[model samples]
Target chain A: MDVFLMIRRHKTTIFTDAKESSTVFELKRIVEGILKRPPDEQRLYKDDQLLDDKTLGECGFTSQTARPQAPATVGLAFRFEALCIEPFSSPP
Target chain B: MYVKLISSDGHEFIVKREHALTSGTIKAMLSGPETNEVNFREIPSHVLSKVCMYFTYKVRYTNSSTEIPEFPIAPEIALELLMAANFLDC
Candidate 1:
């Protein structure tokens, strides 16, 4: 199942199919690859609760439970410094 | 399964009730026990368009593993869109 994510910074969104067993750190890594934002750090949240080290399975991310709160999207707000690894690459 | 959403700017959008439910607030207003049509008069036409597209996009990509794509949005309207997302509880 695709795990949708919403970034609070600009109402940006990310959609993923990361294994429910994957850690949030893994989540950020995929996001970095797709969104190409080379953030030094990021925070994942659900509603107002934090999920820094939890696995997607621990978060109950699945087909059924995932339907709540807008398709069970992980809400987050990132704080990272701007570091452009590739000049011609996408935003990072 | 369709309804008219009238934006503050007077533009009208007729959208699918199923897709519109992607937003929690909208789902409630459109399908609760006492649900009814949502005028959405507080939101502007452009903003309403953005919200509706979001709903439509979610419907199309809810469980797909594909990378979410970014569409160009003017920086000036970024804050406005974010606030509107809050207003609609999206």
Candidate 2:
């Protein structure tokens, strides 16, 4: 089975044997194992729009339930840029 | 001198002969030394709809320097315009 690894803030890696068809929600679950937060609390975007839990396949990702054949690697890096948050704001 | 452009969704647009010439591809075909009938080209309906909409918007807004305009366009529509602009040879 193909596994994917995402390196975390603390230098630990989270692994999942899912295909790219996996939903952002499923990927969130894998991240939840590494962080102490619930999957729904995480935000993920692809091509600028928020990833829809229902239409991941239409967005060109592998199926949520499918597993990868090899281990893929991803990393998260942080920057100290100022951030702004507003609930009703339109996309920029 | 007019042409019919078809869209992916099967929409057809009867555009002005000069308006179609705004696209280099059509202009090239019409201007080619050996060509006689400028109306011989058949653009995909999707491509015509998109290009027509683009020129419509441009004429309405009267501005052309913005990369993505402040006005929102359906993603599919934008994609169609981009494809036409890219493939057009004139």
Candidate 3:
């Protein structure tokens, strides 16, 4: 079955396909495994609405008896706390 | 069944009861009213519709746990909308 997936990375956006059995959490985990970033930092959106807790079925995207293809488009955004520090000072 | 909601200006709108119930206040009010009608006498007609739209959005995405976008707050209605949202517990 045809599937749809996309990711907005630091410099490029990725579009891929997947199986119906996959969950949104697992999908993002797969991408983050090699890089291993903070789990909570990754966020997913569909239709410009939050959907990280939803599964493909919860998202209403599935293949059935009368369709040529199934598609689900998702957008990604990261909100990392910008770290700032007064230059480490040594007691003079 | 549809529900009736009247604004401060006396404008009325009939909307699906489920949609309107997304607001915590509406749910509490109509939870046991013995009927499917409500009169929001304090909310103006224009502000009422905007609040209504937000209810469905909340209902649809409440469980998603992702970023919730801000609804376009029309000019001059920010104060009113904020007050209404505070009342609605949205």
Candidate 4:
């Protein structure tokens, strides 16, 4: 099953889909294209916790998640900063 | 592939094919190097955000036989939203 996320930054809302197995790295790559920031510069967070190297499942997103306002959309925060990591490198 | 939609106020909504294809305007306007990004000059961010929410709603209950829930709309943006919806032809 696929997971949907609503990645927000100030007034911008970036809606995306991922598998429960998707890593935060893959998500940042998605953000990179829209934000014009490299994957190393995009920071994804859930309630202040940085979503580095964690899979969506590790972050508690699954096929059974509930939704009321926005299609089971999990709202996450996005920030631009330097993380200094390779896009294809293994999660640290 | 995911599609990128930009609002008049410069907001970006990155949505999936199923959700984005809900809007006829978007389906027709889609074209780019990746063939996945669309920009709306007449739609502001607030209205555009609600439209995206509506897309989510529409996709979730599409082709269902059960009674569907009403899609919520704030009274403030109703007029502008109507215009947007009319143009988008969702």
Candidate 5:
């Protein structure tokens, strides 16, 4: 079955396809294949929620419903500057 | 003035009005709706404890010019704070 796929790469959204039965791991795998990175290094997000590897099913997500216009996954390399990782040291 | 803050661990923090304003959420709300007593807010125990501690420590020990201390809040903690910030209208 045709499923909508969207990948966020270099701040641009790319559309693609996948089947309904795909797993979260599988989707990441496919994305990594396109980005040429190993799956272990990639991070995934859905609806602002960072999906943990172990609790994908508990997140009420399945490949079937997740496909087709799936939320975009942005590669961190390009967006690293936007993320604040350092600890706040002083009172704001 | 004191505001009640509940942490995920069931710890309740009575934060000073000035201190709670450090959170943009509380600041905006205090200026907006004009509510006097805020009550029964639910904050995740673990996340709120971490943030409250961080804020307390920073306010007490850190110098004014020093950068805001960055705590290695887990992604989940960040999510918790994000939700809290949004809920409190920060």
Candidate 6:
């Protein structure tokens, strides 16, 4: 009935639950809601392989417990930001 | 109808409008001609998530005459969630 995801990024953990039929895209949007980042910039992976257009059921994360003792774990990756340096101008 | 609840940490929770209305604060917000979303800039996601669950519980058992289930709360978060519950006036 529900798929609970414990998404981790280093020491931070995000707790989210969705319907089994919800798409990975939809899950990413929920993460975006929490992280304040766009879904396209977020990369989610279950172990090594990246998660794409698929339902939570297809990912095999559906559970029967009110709260699963071992919820599906996923690692979250974000787009890196480029460090911009302005050219140092000659002393005015 | 559904309502979007945004926490201080930017976590967004989508819950049923009826369930969300369990909070007097949220109900008052929706009574106006404002947007369907309610942002709790003072409530962090961890606490807000529990609050959202409470909303669901309240609505589901509002009419139940049988003994209601106990709402679980972590000992550490009890204080914060208590404050949040007060703020929401549920």
Deviating ranges (above 4 Å) for candidate 3? A1-92, B32-35, B64-70
Task: Name the lDDT of candidate 4.
Answer: 0.66
Candidate 6, superposed: residue stretches over 4 Å from native? A2-49, A52-55, A65-92, B9-11, B33-35, B57-70
Write model 4 residue lDDT over A1-92, tens digit each, in one string.
57766777654566666787888888777766556666654566565566665888888777556232444433344344422221111111
Candidate that would win on lDDT: 4
Candidate 1, A1-92: lDDT as tens digits: 54543333232333333555677777677656545454445666665577665777777676444432344545555564322211111111
Q: CA lDDT, every prediction?
A: 0.56, 0.43, 0.56, 0.66, 0.46, 0.65
Each candidate's TM vs. the true structure?
Answer: 0.44, 0.32, 0.43, 0.65, 0.34, 0.54
Error of 5 at A14 (Å): 50
Candidate 5 interface RMSD, angstroms, 1 decimal: 19.9
Tens-place lDDT digits, model 2, residues B1-90: 344443433333444455566667767765666113333233444345435555444443455463534534567556645655776742
lDDT at residue A47 of model 4 (Cα atoms)? 52
Q: Give the TM-score of candidate 1.
A: 0.44
Give the best candidate by DockQ: 4
Worst 10 residues of 6 chain B by lDDT: B52-61
Off by over 4 Å in 4: A1-3, A10-12, A18-41, A52-68, A71-92, B31-35, B65-67
Worst 10 residues of 4 chain A by lDDT: A83-92
Clashing pairs in 4: none
TM-score of chain A of each: 0.61, 0.43, 0.59, 0.67, 0.50, 0.74
At residue A34, give the lDDT of candidate 4: 57
Per-prediction DockQ, in order? 0.03, 0.01, 0.01, 0.29, 0.01, 0.06
lDDT of 2: 0.43
The DockQ score of candidate 3 comes to: 0.01
Q: Which CAPRI tier for candidate 6?
A: incorrect
For candidate 5 chain A, the 10 contiguous residues with the lowest summed lDDT are A83-92
- Model 5 DockQ vs. reference: 0.01
Candidate with better TM-score, 1 vs 3: 1
